[PDB]
Design an enzyme around this catalytic site. Structure first.
Site, PDB file in Angstrom:
ATOM      1  N   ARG A  18       3.701  -2.599  -9.269  1.00 46.19           N
ATOM      2  CA  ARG A  18       4.890  -2.487  -8.439  1.00 46.19           C
ATOM      3  C   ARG A  18       6.105  -1.965  -9.188  1.00 46.19           C
ATOM      4  NH1 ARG A  18       6.207  -6.705  -3.847  1.00 46.19           N
ATOM      5  NH2 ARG A  18       7.398  -4.796  -3.351  1.00 46.19           N
ATOM      6  N   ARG A  72       5.961 -15.074 -10.472  1.00 52.01           N
ATOM      7  CA  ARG A  72       6.513 -13.731 -10.573  1.00 52.01           C
ATOM      8  C   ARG A  72       7.819 -13.756 -11.352  1.00 52.01           C
ATOM      9  NH1 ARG A  72       4.231 -10.059  -6.908  1.00 52.01           N
ATOM     10  NH2 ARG A  72       1.996 -10.531  -6.751  1.00 52.01           N
ATOM     11  N   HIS A 116       5.375 -16.281  -4.207  1.00 52.04           N
ATOM     12  CA  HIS A 116       6.765 -15.919  -3.955  1.00 52.04           C
ATOM     13  C   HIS A 116       7.400 -17.064  -3.185  1.00 52.04           C
ATOM     14  CE1 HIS A 116       6.830 -11.198  -4.061  1.00 52.04           C
ATOM     15  NE2 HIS A 116       7.187 -11.735  -5.215  1.00 52.04           N
ATOM     16  N   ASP A 143       9.444 -16.924  -0.827  1.00 53.15           N
ATOM     17  CA  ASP A 143       9.560 -16.658   0.605  1.00 53.15           C
ATOM     18  C   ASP A 143       8.258 -16.815   1.359  1.00 53.15           C
ATOM     19  OD1 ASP A 143       8.185 -14.240   0.163  1.00 53.15           O
ATOM     20  OD2 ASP A 143       9.803 -12.964   0.876  1.00 53.15           O
ATOM     21  N   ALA A 187      -2.458  -7.903   2.071  1.00 49.90           N
ATOM     22  CA  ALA A 187      -1.754  -7.668   0.817  1.00 49.90           C
ATOM     23  C   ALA A 187      -0.951  -8.881   0.369  1.00 49.90           C
ATOM     24  CB  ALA A 187      -0.854  -6.441   0.923  1.00 49.90           C
ATOM     25  N   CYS A 240       8.541 -10.776   4.107  1.00 45.23           N
ATOM     26  CA  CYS A 240       8.302  -9.879   2.981  1.00 45.23           C
ATOM     27  C   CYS A 240       8.626  -8.431   3.310  1.00 45.23           C
ATOM     28  CB  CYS A 240       6.844  -9.974   2.545  1.00 45.23           C
ATOM     29  SG  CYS A 240       6.442 -11.470   1.659  1.00 45.23           S
TER      30      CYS A 240
END
Length: 272
Positions: A87, A136, A165, A167, A255, A261
């Site tokens: 990414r 992360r 994550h 979120d 994903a 997201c």
């Protein structure tokens, strides 16, 4: 005066495995179905807020997940530094968007990962920033954020690789409410949450809803937009005053992402 940044799935695929949801899903997404799902989400969000778009870059399929472009407050953005090389190539494109749209950009050291609003979400009254770490974003990034944005940062440790994550398991809402999945956090972090949000303001998700990305919800005022959730959770949200809108996002769950997201609120007012 609410604006949300999205990025269309022109080049969307599952090409690698950087979270558990992607395992076994390489090239299992239908790009045409993903386009349809994204367009439905875009339309639903646009009924509630202005939607700005950034052009997607070929070869960076996760660029659709704009929540990790950066962390916005006022005219400032802390640009994400992605943990995974897969990414990291999105960073120049997101940076260019922020600069073209008038934001002042802060950049972390190259060796210090931080994944933006994907891992850090403001309390909706602006009292502090909740910031996840453990998969992360690095804990050591949190002081940078605290100083750059002049905000208290409440650090929360994620312990389940599925909820990698913030979120995906934690969603501050209007009205003081917090929609979250406690088992994604360690005991100390749960105590920190509980000290600040009293029980009547907690909307606790069970695992069945969590694994369908119920916490990865977009909230604008009293509207909450999410992929699919139980009638139990819908009734809890309705009792708290929220209008729930569901829209199918299965191609994006392949994903490891869902409604929240795919969005980044780029109007985050500095509140007194």
């Amino acid at each position: 005066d609410i604006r949300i940044l999205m990025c269309p799935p022109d080049h969307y695929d599952v090409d690698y495995v950087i979270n558990p949801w992607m395992e076994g899903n390489i090239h299992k997404s239908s790009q045409e179905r993903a386009v349809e799902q994204w367009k439905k989400l875009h339309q639903t969000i646009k009924e509630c807020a202005i939607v700005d778009l950034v052009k997607p870059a070929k070869g960076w399929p996760d660029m659709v997940f704009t929540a990790s472009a950066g962390l916005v407050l006022g005219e400032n953005v802390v640009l994400s530094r992605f943990y995974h090389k897969e990414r990291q190539g999105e960073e120049p494109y997101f940076k260019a968007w922020f600069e073209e749209n008038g934001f002042t950009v802060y950049e972390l050291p190259q060796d210090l990962p931080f994944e933006g609003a994907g891992d850090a979400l403001f309390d909706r009254e602006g009292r502090w920033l909740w910031a996840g770490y453990g998969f992360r974003s690095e804990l050591d990034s949190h002081p940078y954020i605290a100083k750059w944005l002049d905000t208290e940062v409440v650090s929360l440790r994620l312990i389940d690789e599925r909820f990698y994550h913030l979120d995906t398991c934690f969603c501050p809402l209007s009205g003081g409410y917090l929609l979250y999945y406690p088992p994604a956090f360690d005991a100390y972090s749960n105590r920190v949450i509980e000290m600040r949000i009293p029980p009547e303001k907690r909307i606790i998700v069970e695992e069945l809803d969590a694994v369908n990305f119920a916490c990865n919800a977009v909230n604008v005022n009293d509207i909450i937009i999410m992929n699919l959730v139980s009638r139990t959770l819908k009734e809890k949200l309705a009792e708290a005053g929220f209008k729930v809108r569901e829209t199918p996002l299965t191609e994006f769950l392949k994903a490891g992402g869902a409604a929240k997201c795919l969005t980044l609120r780029v109007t985050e007012p500095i509140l007194p």
